[PDB]
Amino acid sequence: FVNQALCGSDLVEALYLVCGERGFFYTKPT
């Protein structure tokens, strides 16, 4: 993994992995 873009699950998937045990604040109205 390198400095790639972080969109869609890639984001949460990168957040979920970086912290995961710390949860995050990914939001979006739908």
Next chain:
Amino acid sequence: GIVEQCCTSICSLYQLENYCN
């Protein structure tokens, strides 16, 4: 704008950690 920063532009997993709770 939590994604727009790491989504569009390039983000570092270390900088992406600033989105956690």
